[PDB]
Design an enzyme around this catalytic site. Structure first.
Site, PDB file in Angstrom:
ATOM      1  N   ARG A  28     -16.028   1.760  -4.548  1.00 34.28           N
ATOM      2  CA  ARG A  28     -16.226   1.786  -3.111  1.00 34.28           C
ATOM      3  C   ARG A  28     -16.286   3.258  -2.688  1.00 34.28           C
ATOM      4  O   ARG A  28     -15.508   4.086  -3.176  1.00 34.28           O
ATOM      5  CB  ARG A  28     -15.063   1.069  -2.448  1.00 34.28           C
ATOM      6  CG  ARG A  28     -15.145   0.992  -0.958  1.00 34.28           C
ATOM      7  CD  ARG A  28     -13.827   0.524  -0.436  1.00 34.28           C
ATOM      8  NE  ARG A  28     -13.419  -0.729  -1.063  1.00 34.28           N
ATOM      9  CZ  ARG A  28     -12.167  -1.006  -1.403  1.00 34.28           C
ATOM     10  NH1 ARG A  28     -11.209  -0.130  -1.141  1.00 34.28           N
ATOM     11  NH2 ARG A  28     -11.857  -2.160  -1.973  1.00 34.28           N
ATOM     12  N   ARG A  68      -6.982   4.960   2.352  1.00 40.07           N
ATOM     13  CA  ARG A  68      -8.148   4.088   2.412  1.00 40.07           C
ATOM     14  C   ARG A  68      -9.144   4.718   3.414  1.00 40.07           C
ATOM     15  O   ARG A  68      -8.840   5.720   4.061  1.00 40.07           O
ATOM     16  CB  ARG A  68      -7.719   2.684   2.862  1.00 40.07           C
ATOM     17  CG  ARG A  68      -7.104   1.846   1.739  1.00 40.07           C
ATOM     18  CD  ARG A  68      -8.132   1.635   0.628  1.00 40.07           C
ATOM     19  NE  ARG A  68      -7.564   1.140  -0.617  1.00 40.07           N
ATOM     20  CZ  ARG A  68      -7.015   1.920  -1.544  1.00 40.07           C
ATOM     21  NH1 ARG A  68      -6.930   3.234  -1.358  1.00 40.07           N
ATOM     22  NH2 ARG A  68      -6.526   1.387  -2.654  1.00 40.07           N
ATOM     23  N   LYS A 101      -0.437   1.824   0.170  1.00 40.52           N
ATOM     24  CA  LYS A 101      -1.651   2.400   0.736  1.00 40.52           C
ATOM     25  C   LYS A 101      -1.659   2.495   2.283  1.00 40.52           C
ATOM     26  O   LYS A 101      -1.156   1.597   2.979  1.00 40.52           O
ATOM     27  CB  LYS A 101      -2.897   1.711   0.166  1.00 40.52           C
ATOM     28  CG  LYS A 101      -2.834   0.209   0.038  1.00 40.52           C
ATOM     29  CD  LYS A 101      -4.098  -0.283  -0.688  1.00 40.52           C
ATOM     30  CE  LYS A 101      -4.435  -1.744  -0.367  1.00 40.52           C
ATOM     31  NZ  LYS A 101      -5.576  -2.198  -1.198  1.00 40.52           N
ATOM     32  N   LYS A 152      -3.709   3.025   5.962  1.00 40.32           N
ATOM     33  CA  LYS A 152      -4.977   2.814   6.643  1.00 40.32           C
ATOM     34  C   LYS A 152      -4.911   3.426   8.053  1.00 40.32           C
ATOM     35  O   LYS A 152      -3.921   3.254   8.764  1.00 40.32           O
ATOM     36  CB  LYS A 152      -5.314   1.326   6.642  1.00 40.32           C
ATOM     37  CG  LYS A 152      -5.630   0.821   5.257  1.00 40.32           C
ATOM     38  CD  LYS A 152      -5.654  -0.694   5.195  1.00 40.32           C
ATOM     39  CE  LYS A 152      -6.118  -1.122   3.814  1.00 40.32           C
ATOM     40  NZ  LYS A 152      -6.393  -2.574   3.778  1.00 40.32           N
ATOM     41  N   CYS A 159     -13.385 -11.122  -6.881  1.00 45.60           N
ATOM     42  CA  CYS A 159     -11.976 -10.808  -6.716  1.00 45.60           C
ATOM     43  C   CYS A 159     -11.047 -11.553  -7.650  1.00 45.60           C
ATOM     44  O   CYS A 159     -10.902 -12.767  -7.576  1.00 45.60           O
ATOM     45  CB  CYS A 159     -11.515 -11.029  -5.282  1.00 45.60           C
ATOM     46  SG  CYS A 159      -9.806 -10.467  -5.031  1.00 45.60           S
TER      47      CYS A 159
HETATM   48  C1  SRM Z   1     -14.012  -5.625   0.356  1.00 42.43           C
HETATM   49  C2  SRM Z   1     -12.795  -5.996   1.175  1.00 42.43           C
HETATM   50  C3  SRM Z   1     -12.774  -7.231   2.038  1.00 42.43           C
HETATM   51  C4  SRM Z   1     -14.119  -7.585   2.614  1.00 42.43           C
HETATM   52  O1  SRM Z   1     -14.571  -8.700   2.328  1.00 42.43           O
HETATM   53  O2  SRM Z   1     -14.722  -6.761   3.328  1.00 42.43           O
HETATM   54  C5  SRM Z   1     -11.586  -6.129   0.294  1.00 42.43           C
HETATM   55  C6  SRM Z   1     -11.530  -6.602  -1.017  1.00 42.43           C
HETATM   56  C7  SRM Z   1     -10.417  -6.407  -1.848  1.00 42.43           C
HETATM   57  N1  SRM Z   1      -9.215  -5.791  -1.510  1.00 42.43           N
HETATM   58 FE1  SRM Z   1      -8.507  -5.446   0.484  1.00 42.43          FE
HETATM   59  N2  SRM Z   1     -10.523  -5.702   1.072  1.00 42.43           N
HETATM   60  C8  SRM Z   1     -10.839  -5.128   2.280  1.00 42.43           C
HETATM   61  C9  SRM Z   1     -10.080  -4.943   3.415  1.00 42.43           C
HETATM   62  C10 SRM Z   1      -8.734  -5.148   3.524  1.00 42.43           C
HETATM   63  C11 SRM Z   1      -7.939  -5.387   4.657  1.00 42.43           C
HETATM   64  C12 SRM Z   1      -8.456  -5.400   6.070  1.00 42.43           C
HETATM   65  C13 SRM Z   1      -8.732  -3.987   6.607  1.00 42.43           C
HETATM   66  O3  SRM Z   1      -8.232  -2.999   6.031  1.00 42.43           O
HETATM   67  O4  SRM Z   1      -9.450  -3.865   7.611  1.00 42.43           O
HETATM   68  C14 SRM Z   1      -6.652  -5.730   4.330  1.00 42.43           C
HETATM   69  C15 SRM Z   1      -5.633  -5.950   5.441  1.00 42.43           C
HETATM   70  C16 SRM Z   1      -4.605  -5.007   6.104  1.00 42.43           C
HETATM   71  C17 SRM Z   1      -3.498  -4.580   5.140  1.00 42.43           C
HETATM   72  O5  SRM Z   1      -3.828  -3.893   4.141  1.00 42.43           O
HETATM   73  O6  SRM Z   1      -2.320  -4.954   5.367  1.00 42.43           O
HETATM   74  C18 SRM Z   1      -6.640  -5.723   2.893  1.00 42.43           C
HETATM   75  C19 SRM Z   1      -5.629  -6.058   1.961  1.00 42.43           C
HETATM   76  C20 SRM Z   1      -5.531  -5.936   0.540  1.00 42.43           C
HETATM   77  C21 SRM Z   1      -4.354  -5.866  -0.287  1.00 42.43           C
HETATM   78  C22 SRM Z   1      -2.904  -6.237   0.191  1.00 42.43           C
HETATM   79  C23 SRM Z   1      -2.344  -4.907   0.649  1.00 42.43           C
HETATM   80  C24 SRM Z   1      -0.839  -4.870   0.738  1.00 42.43           C
HETATM   81  O7  SRM Z   1      -0.316  -4.045   1.501  1.00 42.43           O
HETATM   82  O8  SRM Z   1      -0.170  -5.640   0.039  1.00 42.43           O
HETATM   83  C25 SRM Z   1      -4.780  -5.980  -1.622  1.00 42.43           C
HETATM   84  C26 SRM Z   1      -3.910  -6.292  -2.862  1.00 42.43           C
HETATM   85  C27 SRM Z   1      -3.095  -5.079  -3.236  1.00 42.43           C
HETATM   86  O9  SRM Z   1      -3.523  -3.955  -2.897  1.00 42.43           O
HETATM   87  O10 SRM Z   1      -2.030  -5.240  -3.875  1.00 42.43           O
HETATM   88  C28 SRM Z   1      -6.188  -5.979  -1.616  1.00 42.43           C
HETATM   89  C29 SRM Z   1      -7.032  -5.874  -2.700  1.00 42.43           C
HETATM   90  C30 SRM Z   1      -8.391  -5.936  -2.601  1.00 42.43           C
HETATM   91  C31 SRM Z   1      -9.147  -6.247  -3.849  1.00 42.43           C
HETATM   92  C32 SRM Z   1      -9.586  -4.824  -4.340  1.00 42.43           C
HETATM   93  C33 SRM Z   1      -8.564  -7.038  -5.014  1.00 42.43           C
HETATM   94  C34 SRM Z   1      -7.951  -6.277  -6.179  1.00 42.43           C
HETATM   95  O11 SRM Z   1      -7.022  -5.472  -5.940  1.00 42.43           O
HETATM   96  O12 SRM Z   1      -8.387  -6.479  -7.343  1.00 42.43           O
HETATM   97  C35 SRM Z   1     -10.428  -6.867  -3.321  1.00 42.43           C
HETATM   98  C36 SRM Z   1     -11.640  -6.979  -4.210  1.00 42.43           C
HETATM   99  C37 SRM Z   1     -12.780  -7.965  -4.099  1.00 42.43           C
HETATM  100  C38 SRM Z   1     -14.025  -7.485  -4.814  1.00 42.43           C
HETATM  101  O13 SRM Z   1     -14.176  -7.784  -6.016  1.00 42.43           O
HETATM  102  O14 SRM Z   1     -14.848  -6.780  -4.176  1.00 42.43           O
HETATM  103  N3  SRM Z   1      -6.600  -5.830  -0.313  1.00 42.43           N
HETATM  104  N4  SRM Z   1      -7.902  -5.318   2.469  1.00 42.43           N
HETATM  105  C39 SRM Z   1     -12.285  -4.779   2.014  1.00 42.43           C
HETATM  106  C40 SRM Z   1     -12.253  -3.466   1.200  1.00 42.43           C
HETATM  107  C41 SRM Z   1     -12.159  -2.538   2.401  1.00 42.43           C
HETATM  108  C42 SRM Z   1     -12.539  -1.108   2.074  1.00 42.43           C
HETATM  109  O15 SRM Z   1     -13.721  -0.749   2.233  1.00 42.43           O
HETATM  110  O16 SRM Z   1     -11.648  -0.343   1.685  1.00 42.43           O
HETATM  111  S1  SF4 Z   2      -9.399 -13.155  -2.137  1.00 40.63           S
HETATM  112 FE1  SF4 Z   2      -7.493 -11.967  -1.517  1.00 40.63          FE
HETATM  113  S2  SF4 Z   2      -7.506  -9.924  -2.570  1.00 40.63           S
HETATM  114 FE2  SF4 Z   2      -9.487 -11.000  -2.897  1.00 40.63          FE
HETATM  115  S3  SF4 Z   2     -10.802 -10.025  -1.255  1.00 40.63           S
HETATM  116 FE3  SF4 Z   2     -10.031 -11.934  -0.384  1.00 40.63          FE
HETATM  117  S4  SF4 Z   2      -7.997 -11.538   0.570  1.00 40.63           S
HETATM  118 FE4  SF4 Z   2      -8.590  -9.625  -0.635  1.00 40.63          FE
END
Ligand code: SRM
Ligand code: SF4
Ligand SMILES: [K+]
Length: 456
Positions: A3, A65, A101, A103, A326
């Protein structure tokens, strides 16, 4: 998976052409996935950096992020400044190790397109005479939760106070550092700022921040939000400039049978005079279109199936990536949403609410990437075909929806909404949003203090 760090969602036509080439040439899926954090994702990379680097991009050890910024402000002029400041916060924060992380966002009222409550650090712009004068600071938002773990919770950000433009980077850095130091040392599930703030207290954290910055915050300055949606279609920008915001379902950019979405974009990128902006709603804005060029630009989007009319509902719906890429997914999200919104559109038409919308999001698993925890109606993945249904949020995104039903299927979900959408359609007041009505009508109690009352 990779990304790119693209502050404010602003990307050039030149950079667009490079990644389009890479997307189709060197990935399994050949798609460009616009994310809800104003950037893109390549899926299945079988070099990425040399090509990123050549066009001026970098793919961010670092817990920072992508920094967001209101993409299409009603007061078009404020964008460039708000954007310059999003890019500075992003460069200042570039590597101290963060427990979890972080944001951050730059918000331009009354638009909360960037969903500030899902974020750790938020700079809400205050402007006078078309000039930014400072920022209202909001700290502590976060959506991630763990199924059945009542020690985890989603939280909305808290106001800290106002600060003049000159004290922006000193504050961003003190917030980050007070988190770095005060974040939990044992477990990573309690590391988040939302957790630290609840453990030491908002005032306690605030004072350390003032102490560390060398300032004393001013009272919060008036601000309100009217929505979180994109302005689909054309809008008047500055001077003779026009803005065309194209709706892109799930932000998945690829050529489809009779819908060359990807080629449409490369053809547009070739003639477009300005740049593009990736929205917080997974859509794309073609920015800086001189009035002269509108015919040219519109024809191509029309040709490619990029301006295909969709209901207001589908315009205000979102889902995370989830399956198939994912590894944390529990239930479909991106691949489930279209069909589901078809089913929803039918129900809205059934109740004479077709011209209306409900902020509806589908998150694959409880990590919350789909921001369903700030949705009027959220779907939280629990198992194959199974989701937790939440209700009670609002249009602007300041309320966390309580779980209404747990571990149910699409048919069960559909039946629950058919019932209540009907209620709302006949019983709501003048311009009364869905989530509000479910809170007013007694359908669901509201979450008034997250860390304490989110869970039943
Ligand atoms: C692409 C995206 C969602 C979307 O459909 O658009 C996404 C996709 C993933 N995010 Fe995220 N998240 C995305 C926005 C968010 C958001 C919403 C936001 O930021 O606007 C959240 C919610 C707010 C928050 O963080 O509390 C979010 C919360 C997480 C977390 C849980 C974070 C935590 O504090 O526990 C993880 C899992 C982790 O990091 O342990 C996760 C992990 C992931 C992972 C990378 C899974 C992984 O760790 O293997 C996803 C991968 C899917 C793939 O194969 O592409 N993603 N993630 C966004 C990536 C954003 C970017 O450009 O950086
Ligand atoms: S399935 Fe869970 S970790 Fe994977 S992109 Fe969606 S909310 Fe984030
Ligand atoms: K979108």
């Amino acid at each position: 998976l990779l990304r790119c760090r693209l502050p404010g969602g602003v990307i050039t036509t030149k950079q667009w052409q490079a990644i389009d080439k890479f997307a189709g040439e060197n990935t399994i899926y050949g798609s460009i996935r616009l994310t809800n954090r104003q950037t893109f994702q390549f899926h299945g990379i079988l070099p990425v950096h040399q090509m990123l680097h050549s066009v001026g991009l970098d793919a961010l050890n670092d817990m920072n992020r992508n920094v967001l910024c209101t993409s299409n402000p009603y007061e078009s002029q404020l964008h460039a400044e708000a954007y310059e400041w999003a890019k500075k916060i992003s460069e200042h924060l570039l590597p101290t190790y963060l427990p979890r992380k972080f944001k951050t966002t730059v918000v331009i009222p009354p638009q909360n397109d960037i969903d500030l409550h899902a974020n750790d650090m938020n700079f809400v712009a205050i402007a006078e005479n078309g000039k930014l004068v400072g920022f209202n600071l909001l700290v502590g938002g976060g959506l991630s939760i763990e199924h059945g773990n009542k020690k985890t919770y989603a939280r909305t950000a808290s106001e800290f106070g106002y600060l003049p433009l000159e004290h922006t980077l000193a504050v961003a850095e003190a917030v980050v550092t007070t988190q770095r130091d005060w974040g939990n040392r044992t477990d990573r599930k309690n590391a988040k700022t939302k957790y630290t703030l609840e453990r030491v207290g908002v005032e306690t954290f605030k004072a350390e921040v003032e102490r560390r910055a060398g300032i004393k915050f001013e009272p919060i300055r008036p601000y309100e939000f009217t929505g979180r949606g994109d302005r689909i279609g054309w809008v008047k920008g500055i001077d003779d400039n026009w803005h065309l915001t194209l709706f892109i379902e799930n932000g998945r950019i690829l050529d489809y049978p009779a819908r060359p979405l990807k080629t449409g974009l490369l053809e547009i990128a070739k003639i477009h005079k300005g740049d593009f902006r990736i929205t917080a709603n997974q859509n794309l804005i073609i920015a800086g279109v001189p009035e002269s060029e509108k015919a040219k630009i519109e024809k191509i989007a029309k040709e490619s199936g990029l301006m295909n009319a969709v209901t207001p509902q589908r315009e205000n719906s979102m889902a995370c990536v989830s399956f198939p890429t994912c590894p944390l997914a529990m239930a479909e999200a991106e691949r489930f949403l279209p069909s589901f919104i078809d089913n929803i559109d039918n129900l809205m038409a059934k109740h004479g609410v077709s011209d209306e919308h409900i902020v509806m999001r589908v998150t694959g698993c409880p990590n919350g990437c789909g921001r369903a925890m700030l949705a009027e109606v959220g779907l939280v993945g629990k198992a194959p075909g199974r989701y937790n249904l939440h209700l009670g949020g609002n249009r602007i995104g300041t309320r966390i929806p309580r779980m209404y039903k747990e571990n149910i299927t699409e048919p069960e979900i559909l039946a629950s909404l058919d019932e209540l959408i009907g209620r709302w359609a006949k019983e709501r007041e003048a311009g009364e949003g869905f989530g509000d009505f479910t809170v007013r009508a007694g359908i669901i109690r509201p979450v008034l203090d997250p860390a304490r009352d989110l869970w039943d």
